Every structure is written in structure tokens, then in C-alpha cells.
Nucleic acid binder design. Structure first.
Lengths: 133, 133, 133, 133, 132, 133, 133, 133
DNA sequence: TATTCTTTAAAGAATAG
DNA sequence: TATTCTTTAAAGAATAG
DNA sequence: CTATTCTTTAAAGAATA
DNA sequence: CTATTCTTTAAAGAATA
């Protein structure tokens, strides 16, 4: 299980970034809004990752801060939320803003994000409100 | 997911090439006609790759140009076309020639390729014509 | 199959340790009581490992001594004893103490460990007593 | 797919050898009789490999010569012959001796090897005689 | 797919009833509270059923009224609600009472039933309120 | 495999009909337009059936004439056409009209049916035109 | 799920009996020692059954008394005890004798039965002793 | 498991026969040559059957004599011999003739049958010669 | 005509055309 | 008593005890 | 406004809380 | 001499030969 990658940025093409380590280039998926913090190509960068394995595919997701990775891992455990939707949420709201919205049940703050329906937002609040404690 | 490999060419035995990186040798499958561009053994080379995972096997395909990899990925999504047949198409025609043939429905230009039947060419045109747009 | 890792300690957060080798950081799970022997962060360390693969996840376990790894591999073959429970046993008792307890059938020595029920301890003795010989 | 490994011999414990490359130690299974050719521990060695993937396990097999690897790959395709039995055959007979025995149908030359039954030897000759041509 | 069974009652051992049709005896699972309506053994009875198939098992559930079967089928589509739990709900509340409780969000009316947790009751209301 | 059912009609609730045979009531799915031919409830009826089995469900489909069943079986072999869609086609057009439309490539005659898109109709013509011969 | 069968005995060929009901003949497996109680062929008989389903096969087991069926169902839940082995136990010992032996730990009373090993008998006692209560 | 069917013949369309029992019509597959012995439609008939189950399909095969069913069951256990091929063999040769040919290794007697290749015939003799004893 | 070789869903419910 | 958390075959046919 | 795309995938046991 | 361990795990389609 790859926990962190450090290497040279070869190419930047949202949502994918390519990092080279010892001649091996790794395809990393990243949130659209965190992409702005990556250095210019040819510079070294560091990214925290989570490794996903499926019967037909293997994928690697990256984040600029451990806080982001923690919230991502928690989201994907909620039924009906997969990696694509999870990245969308992190693109729309910062991790701290999301926690506040769930505790306050600001349904409208979630429904405005792309791809999230009314039923989905209700389900998220019901499930997530119990884990932050 | 390995996106690119850079290393020393150890052996060339069409259709397989062996690249060494840090003492690990990777088996790579490549189109017969792109094989002519690889440098002489012992020289460094760069190859773009796509990683395929199946219940009983893992395989790594390589291409000399991003254009080739893009068309390959699109072909394998078509039902009834797998990596073996896809490499044949890329061996027979250049990527640009293939696009022209599909848009023009030059059925004969495709059927002449080895391993492609009349029904197969009909299916390819019907599916691919809608994706290039 | 990864048999041993040698690298720099990046972070220590029981039960997980992060080792960096050539820019790749590996997540390793270790027994709570062996964690005390790891050097201070930034120093080099060596850990013997066992690689577990499942349909939905891949995991890497580490141990400070080959003796521990051998007993771990034997435990996980016993029905009902999974990697999580196996690490608990190794946390509570040294490998040598465990062997003695099984041969003597000291049921109380096992039942006192966290997460182990009376039925579980009975099952362990019945299965393990035949393998040490 | 790992095709070749080059590294330092860390430990030799038949049938397993441990090779270190860049701080990662790889477990490699090898034929009992080819093991005698490996250098002394601490020296560099080269081994040709084949990578086996299964739903519950991943394994890496190694051979000193490309000839051995080729015959191994052919054997494991025969129904009822698995990697364990395949290594036994390569331990008892050299690749050249095996070919001669099959073409001559020297049933006794095969049955004398450990773990091979009369039915198994008959099946091997029937299947293998057609592939060498 | 068996939709209805008509036959002679052979044995009654809650939660299972045994019905014989042409020499074949079918094991049927039923709600604990609907069991009281079944006639005396040896009499003919009619039961509406739903057929469940899994990789390792096949099961046949029965109900006295089409209303019950309809609500059962809807319950089992909710994530985390298995047939075992679904039968418990139908044992505790009538179909009409359940509908009212969901629309009114009377959380306490659900949590009192055996096996139903607070989180489960919240989940049920959120999912079911949209289907009726 | 149940090939035909003969019994008493118990209930008629499109698209499902319930037939009783010896105290067992079978749920049968039928085309919306063939439902008009079924006798009044309480009368005996005959229906030709096809039995579908899946990992999670078993289903039984019925038709008034062998011609209908034959075309249904051929449709479901085409990739992307499920039993639900197949019943829709048989509801919109008679079996004879469908054959004529495919041979003539009357794309508009198909696209007007509910649930069938332009791409779907193109795929159907390409695949079906070869089987009627 | 078939719970009971009543019909005419067509054939008796231990361990299989064939019962006809309405023109359908069902294959039933029965314990070797209960087979002696079945009436002469052509007479009616009653047998309690348990239905077993697997990915590749379906099987139907029968017993003369509910007591036997209950113990059979309990046995097959024990890990390592297959239906074949469970029928052997019921052939060697009556249900009542088995209960007495387990509670008394009369290991020799079990090991003497065909196909039962020492390890198996130990496992059986450990698991079954807790369920009769 | 349906072992025998008795009922009225509804339709005869090689290789399928349709038998009605209590209003349920069963599709039965039979050898081309045994089909000649079936009575005229509307008469009662008896057929011995074997029930095959797969993840995607259920099928029922029938034979006029227990001898045929016994040989069929044995053939399908041989690797590479499917039910389709097994019915072909029984169409070409009587059960008694087949046994004689295997014991004598009359390769030509088998290769002449449709669908059977030289490699297949060799494999059959090797496997079947050991079971009749 | 035999040969060996490949290639592997449907629904729902959200947003586009 | 509810909670969340884990853990996942059978056969054959060769060889030991 | 209707079609097209996409994407996502069990429950019971027996401990402990 | 009889028990214990182990180890291994589809077929049809439609091309081409």
C-alpha cells in the first residue's frame, strides 16, 4: 500500500498529474481545487495518497494534506458515494466547511454542489453526523 | 498505475521488449510497426504505457506516442475487441488513417487487415464514428 | 511478494509506521508491543514483512524478528483467526510464552487477552498443539 | 510483469531465495537443483522470472536460464500440472532430457520422479508430444 | 417464481409452516403475528409468497394479504434491511401504522421494536418517506 | 426448464399474469399487446415460456405464439438488449413488421418506439440483419 | 425449499432411493442404516428432507425421523464436516448415542467410525459440546 | 434433482422433446439416434434424466436406458468433453461399441465421428481406459 | 473440416440535447 | 440490550505412520 | 422534454461496550 | 496397511489454417 509519493512533476493535465520516481511514472488523480497548489512542472512535489483496488482496475488518489485524505476515506465508506463523487465534494467545499454544514444540516449548502441531489444530501447528513462526534 | 517507463533496453524480441529500471525488468507489449523506432539495445528509451489487470493476469502495453495510447484505450472499450486485436489494427494503419476510414466508412480499408472480418468492421464503424465527433 | 523492507522512518502512529524507499512510502502494520523497539524517526530501520492480498484490499504486515513472522503465518491459517486477532495475540504474549501455554493448555493464560473468548482459546489449543510437535 | 531481477543475495533457504533491490527484498522460488549455481550470499546475481497471480496470492518464480523458464511456462498450461509439480520435474530432469523422454515415450523415466503417478506420466506424454514438433 | 400456494397445513411451528401440495411439502416463513390467522392443522389455507434466491440458499416467505407482501418487498430494497429484520417490523406494527409513523417521523414508534437501532430508524424514515 | 404452462387464470395485472397449476401459482411476464388475447379470469389458458436464471433472481416470460418466443430469444442475445427492452419492442411492433424494418433499414420505424435511441436502432440493424438470412 | 416428500418407491439402490410424485422422480440420498426401514418397492413412503444448493449442483437428503434431520443440519455447520461425512456418522451411531459420546468425550467411540480421524474427533467434541446445552 | 420423467409427448423437434406432466411442459435434450424410439405424439413415454446446473443456465438431458445415462455421466467428467460433444458420441456409437473401441484403442473408430479430433480421441482413450477396469 | 485462438451484465438517478 | 466490528468450500489422488 | 450517459455492488456471528 | 495431507479448479463463437 503506497502511502506517500515524492518525485518530479512530469505533466499536469487536470484531473491527472504524472509524478516520476526512479524512471517509473505514476498516474495520480487529484481534487480540481487542490491542483492549483502544485508547483511548476519539473519541480519536486509531495502528495499523500490512498490506493484503491478493484477486480478490473487499480487507481491511486492524491491529496495535499492529511486532513483531506482522512475526510476522503470516511466519505467513500458511505453507501452510494464513490471516488468520483467524493472528489467533487472536496472540490466544492473545504474540509472544515463540510463539517460545519453537516452539523448544522445546511441542506442547501450541499445541494448546490454539482452532481448532488436532494436525496443524496439527506443521506450524507444522516450518516456523517454520527462519525465526527 | 504505471503511466510511463524510462530505462535501458535489455532485449528486443517482437512483440515483447524488456526495459530495466533499478534492477527490475519490465515486460512490455508493443505494436509491430512501432518496434522499428526503438533504439539499439543498451540505449535508453521512453515508452507510454497502459496497465491492464484481470483476475488471472496482469499485462503492460507500451506505445511511442500519446496519440497511439489514446486510440488504443478507446478501441478496447468497444465490445468484442480486446488488446490482441487492438494491437493488430495499430500495426496495420496509422492513427490518422484509421480516423479517416471510419468517418468515410471505407469498409474495404479495414477488412483487408489480418484478423478482421466483415461483421467486425461494420461493428467498428457503427461504434467509433460517434466518439470522434 | 515483498519479503523485507529497509528504509527511513517518516512517521510513527501506532499501529501504522511509514517507511520511505526511493520516494515511495509504504504503510506497515505492526504489533503494539514491538513498536517500542523502532528507532527514532528519521533513522533507518529493517522490518520483515508478509504480504496479504484480498479481492478488495492489499495489506503489508511487519515484524522485528523472523520468529514473530513465522508464528503469525501459522496463526492466520487457523480458521476464525484473522490478521487483526493475530496481532492482538502477539501484542499480549511473546512467541516463546505462547508455545508454552498451548502445550500446557493454560486456558486462563489465553482467555485473559483482549478479544479472546473461551471458545476461541479452546479452538486455538486444539489446532496449534499438533503443529509445534 | 517482472521479467528479470538483478540484485544482492541476502539469504538462501531452499526453496526460497531473497534478493534485495533498492531496499525491497523479493521472495523467489527456485528449482532445488538450480539452487547450487547461485553465488555466495552478498554477491550479485541475475534470475529470470515468471509472475503468477491468483485471487488469494501472488508468487514469483525464478530460473537461471531462459530455456528453463520456457519449459516451465509450457508445463503449467497442461491441465492437472501446477507450479509445485512443475518445479519437481525441473528438479529431477534437465530440460533436454525431458524432451527426449517425451518423444521416446519412456514412461519409466518420468514415473521414477517424486510425486508423479502412472496416469500423470501418460497424460504428460499425450499432451506435450504435440507441442515441441 | 412461485406467487401463491394453496394446500393442506401439515405442521405449525413458528416461524415455519409446512404446506403440502401433491406430496411436496413446502417450508414457508411467516410473520409471528399473522400466524394466529392460520386455520387448524389439516385444513386448507392460502398464502401469498415471495421467492428469495441466493448463491448458497433458497427461501420462501409467505403473507396473508397482498398489502403485507407489497410492503415487505419495498423494505428489503432498503440497504441494511434483511429479510429477518423485515419480518420483525411486520410483527411489531400493522402496515397502515408503519406508513403513518414514517410520514410523521415518529422515531419513538420504531425504536421500540426489537432489533431496531436509533441509526436504523433514522435511515428507514429518510429512505421510505420518498416512496409512499 | 419450463417450456409451456397450462392452467387457470387467477389474476391479470399488466404486465404480470398469475396461472395456477395444482395449487402452485406462477408469476408470468408478458408483452403489453399480447395481454389483450388472454381469456377472462377463471378460464384455462396456454402460454409458451422461456426461463431466465441469474445469480440473484429467477424469472419466467410468456408469449402467445412460438413465433414471438423465437424472436425474443434472438433479441436477448444481442449485446445491450435486456429482457425489459425486448418486451418493449414486441409491444410496439409485430414480429413480421420488425423483420421487414430491419431488412429495409427503416431506422425511423424503430426509433419511434419507447426507450429506443438512434444508436440502439443502428446497433440492432447491424446485428439482426445477418441472422434472418 | 422442499421439506417433506410423499410418494411411491420406484427403485432402491443404496445410497440412493427414487420416489415418484405425479410423474416426477426425485433422487434422494439416505443414511445406509436407515435404508433398512424403507418399505418394499411399489409401496408409499414418507421422508423428511433437507435441500442443499451449490454453484454447480443441487442435492436432496432424506431421513426417516425429524430427530435425524435436526442433528444432520447441526453437523454440517461445523467447519470441515461435509454432507458425505455427516451421513457416515449417522450410519455408525444413533442420534442418542452420539450425544452421549460427545458429552462424555468418549474419543474412542468416534475414532472407530470409518473416515473419522483423531484430529477430526477432537474438533467435533470441542464444537458440538457447546450446542446441546 | 429430477431423476425420471413420465408424461405425455406434446411435440417432437430434434434434438428437443416436450413432455407434459400436470400442466408443466419440460424441455428435454436427447441423442439423435435414441429419438427414433420415442412413441408417436400424444402417447405416454418414460425417460431417464440428468439435471445440469450452471450460473447462467439450467438444462435437462434424457436417455431411453440407464446404460446410456451412466456412460454420459462418466464422459462429462473428462476434461474438455462438454454435454454437446457427449451427445454426439452417443449418437455415433452404441455404449457397448464405445467400450470395445477404447479397450482396443481403435483410434480410427472414434476420429470418424463428427466433431472429434485426433487429439481429442487420444485424450479420451487415455482417460476412459482406466475407469471401466 | 479441424484447429486454436479469443472475449465476458442491468439496473437506477443524476445531468445533457 | 445495541453496537460495530470481523471472517469466508468440497473433492481427488498422490504420499506418509 | 426524452434520451444518454454515467456510476455503484451482500448479511449473520460473537465477541465487547 | 489405512489415514492425512496435499493440491488444483468452465465451454461456445468465429474467425484462420
Amino acid at each position: 500500500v503506497i502511502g506517500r509519493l515524492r518525485g518530479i512533476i512530469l505533466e499536469k493535465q487536470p484531473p491527472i498529474v504524472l509524478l516520476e520516481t526512479g524512471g517509473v511514472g505514476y498516474e495520480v488523480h487529484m481534487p480540481m481545487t487542490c491542483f492549483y497548489e502544485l508547483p511548476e512542472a519539473g519541480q519536486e512535489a509531495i502528495v499523500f495518497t490512498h490506493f484503491v483496488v478493484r477486480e478490473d482496475a487499480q487507481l491511486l488518489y492524491g491529496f495535499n494534506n492529511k486532513q483531506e485524505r482522512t475526510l476522503f476515506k470516511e466519505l467513500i465508506k458511505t453507501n452510494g458515494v464513490g471516488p468520483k463523487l467524493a472528489l467533487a465534494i472536496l472540490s466544492g467545499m473545504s474540509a472544515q466547511q463540510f463539517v460545519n454544514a453537516v452539523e448544522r444540516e445546511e441542506l442547501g449548502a450541499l445541494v448546490k454542489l454539482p452532481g448532488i441531489g436532494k436525496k443524496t444530501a439527506e443521506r450524507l447528513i444522516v450518516e456523517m453526523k454520527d462519525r465526527f462526534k
